UniProtKB/Swiss-Prot annotation:
Organism lineage: Eukaryota, Metazoa, Chordata, Craniata, Vertebrata
Cell compartment(s), UniProt: Late endosome membrane
Segments forming domain MIT: 1-72
Domain free text: The MIT domain serves as an adapter for ESCRT-III proteins. It forms an asymmetric three-helix bundle that binds amphipathic MIM (MIT interacting motif) helices along the groove between MIT helices 2 and 3 present in a subset of ESCRT-III proteins thus establishing the canonical MIM-MIT interaction. In an extended conformation along the groove between helices 1 and 3, also binds to a type-2 MIT interacting motif (MIM2).
Function of the molecule: Involved in late steps of the endosomal multivesicular bodies (MVB) pathway. Recognizes membrane-associated ESCRT-III assemblies and catalyzes their ATP-dependent disassembly, possibly in combination with membrane fission. Redistributes the ESCRT-III components to the cytoplasm for further rounds of MVB sorting. (Microbial infection) In conjunction with the ESCRT machinery also appears to function in topologically equivalent membrane fission events, such as the terminal stages of cytokinesis and enveloped virus budding (HIV-1 and other lentiviruses).
Encoding gene per record: VPS4B
Protein family per UniProt: Belongs to the AAA ATPase family.
Part of the intact protein present: 7 to 78 of 444
Name of this protein: Vacuolar protein sorting-associated protein 4B
Tissue: Ubiquitously expressed.
Coiled-coil residue spans: 13-72
Organism of origin: Homo sapiens
Impact noted for substituting A9D: Reduces HIV-1 release 2-fold
Domain of life: Eukaryota
Assembly behavior: Proposed to be monomeric or homodimeric in nucleotide-free form and to oligomerize upon binding to ATP to form two stacked hexameric or heptameric rings with a central pore through which ESCRT-III substrates are translocated in an ATP-dependent manner. In vitro, associates on the inside of a helical tubular structure formed by a CHMP2A-CHMP3 polymer. Interacts with CHMP1A, CHMP1B, CHMP2A, CHMP4B and CHMP6. Interacts with VPS4A; the interaction suggests a heteromeric assembly with VPS4A. Interacts with VTA1.
Length: 72
């Protein structure tokens, strides 16, 4: 589940930066879904969880704004 979060997160960050926002948006949410799934179920460690928390918020903030205008 962790590898899926990073894999999708990398493609999402590249999609938005490249030009694709629609595909990147759906990818951003996916990365956060898998990331939180691990932290909630069984993360790697204390410091590890803190790393995902900052990342989960980073992508969420980007995707949040993206969908904002996309939906408007």
């Amino acid at each position: 589940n962790l590898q899926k979060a990073i894999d999708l997160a990398s493609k999402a960050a590249q999609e938005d930066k490249a030009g694709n926002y629609e595909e990147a948006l759906q990818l951003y949410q996916h990365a956060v879904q898998y990331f939180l799934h691990v932290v909630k179920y069984e993360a790697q460690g204390d410091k590890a969880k803190q790393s995902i928390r900052a990342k989960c918020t980073e992508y969420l903030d980007r995707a949040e704004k993206l969908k904002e205008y996309l939906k408007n």
